[PDB]
Design an enzyme around this catalytic site. Structure first.
Site, PDB file in Angstrom:
ATOM      1  N   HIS A   1     -21.039  23.721 -31.238  1.00  0.00           N
ATOM      2  CA  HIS A   1     -22.714  24.342 -31.982  1.00  0.00           C
ATOM      3  C   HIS A   1     -23.651  24.932 -32.308  1.00  0.00           C
ATOM      4  CE1 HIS A   1     -25.537  21.687 -30.293  1.00  0.00           C
ATOM      5  NE2 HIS A   1     -26.783  22.818 -30.831  1.00  0.00           N
TER       6      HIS A   1
ATOM      7  N   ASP B   1     -18.518  18.263 -28.850  1.00  0.00           N
ATOM      8  CA  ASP B   1     -19.645  19.677 -29.394  1.00  0.00           C
ATOM      9  C   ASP B   1     -18.940  20.640 -27.777  1.00  0.00           C
ATOM     10  OD1 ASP B   1     -21.359  21.109 -30.003  1.00  0.00           O
ATOM     11  OD2 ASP B   1     -22.819  20.593 -29.873  1.00  0.00           O
TER      12      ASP B   1
ATOM     13  N   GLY C   1     -33.606  25.174 -28.501  1.00  0.00           N
ATOM     14  CA  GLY C   1     -32.465  25.899 -28.095  1.00  0.00           C
ATOM     15  C   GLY C   1     -32.261  25.664 -26.941  1.00  0.00           C
TER      16      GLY C   1
ATOM     17  N   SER D   1     -30.097  23.928 -26.482  1.00  0.00           N
ATOM     18  CA  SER D   1     -28.265  24.000 -26.321  1.00  0.00           C
ATOM     19  C   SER D   1     -27.811  24.159 -25.384  1.00  0.00           C
ATOM     20  CB  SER D   1     -28.628  23.369 -28.017  1.00  0.00           C
ATOM     21  OG  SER D   1     -28.984  22.893 -28.820  1.00  0.00           O
ATOM     22  N   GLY D   2     -26.394  23.326 -25.018  1.00  0.00           N
ATOM     23  CA  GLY D   2     -25.070  24.370 -24.792  1.00  0.00           C
ATOM     24  C   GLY D   2     -25.153  24.840 -23.273  1.00  0.00           C
TER      25      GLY D   2
END
Ligand SMILES: [Ca+2]
Length: 223
Positions: free
Chosen positions: A40, A84, A175, A177-178
């Site tokens: 995402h 994801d 922020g 995320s990942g």
């Protein structure tokens, strides 16, 4: 990260910032040429920023490298956030040193109750907005499959786990995320989703990396 602490400069050497003119997601360096992040987080025009602490000041340990290719998981579903995960190949190999280092992939999945380190440049407020310049850290345990599913009925797949605190106050956020969830020196999760941040009974939800190691290794081997 809500309710965490200042990591310390370059103490999380596998932490990357994905930059498209501005920080927009975290990632983890898994070898000299490859980064793992959340699907995402996909966009074109990514610059991978390694060796960062203050993302707004050049401090001397940075490596900025453009992505040459991005690979979203074949089965990623953006509605459910199942699978994801994405891989990003760097245009050139990073120079690995004490402050820019890869993180080991798991050979085995982690269990509920294991403590892990979650890091990123995401929001630090749960009913506010404040984005830090330096990297933030949170130590948090993996939660049971049953508590995870109870918190988020009908939403948790076999490719997701929860980690954090059901009482609220301590979580990852927008922020982050990942970015990484590292448990006993292995990359076990990717910051994925959650209802708000640091809310009671709404823990963080993370991509379960150990399910993807075969895909990661074969993708690297052929790209
Ligand atoms: Ca910097």
């Amino acid at each position: 990260i809500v309710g965490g602490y200042t990591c310390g400069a370059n103490t999380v050497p596998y932490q990357v910032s994905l930059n498209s003119g501005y920080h927009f997601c975290g990632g983890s360096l898994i070898n000299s040429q490859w980064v793992v992040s959340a699907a995402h987080c996909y966009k074109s025009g990514i610059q991978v920023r390694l060796g960062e602490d203050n993302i707004n000041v050049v401090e001397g340990n940075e490596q900025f490298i453009s992505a040459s290719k991005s690979i979203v998981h074949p089965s990623y579903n953006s509605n459910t956030l199942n699978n994801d995960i994405m891989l990003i190949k760097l245009k050139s190999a990073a120079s690995l040193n004490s402050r820019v280092a890869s993180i080991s992939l798991p050979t085995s999945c982690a269990s509920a109750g294991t403590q892990c380190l979650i890091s990123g440049w995401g929001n630090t407020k749960s009913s506010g907005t404040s984005y830090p310049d330096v990297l933030k850290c949170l130590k948090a345990p993996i939660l049971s499959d049953s508590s995870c599913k109870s918190a988020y009925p009908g939403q948790i797949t076999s490719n997701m786990f929860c980690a954090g605190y059901l009482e609220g106050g301590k979580d990852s956020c927008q922020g982050d995320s990942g970015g990484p969830v590292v448990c006993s020196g292995k990359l076990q999760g990717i910051v994925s989703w959650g209802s708000g941040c640091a809310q009671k009974n709404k823990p963080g939800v993370y991509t379960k990396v150990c399910n993807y190691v075969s895909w990661i290794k074969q993708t690297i081997a052929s790209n």
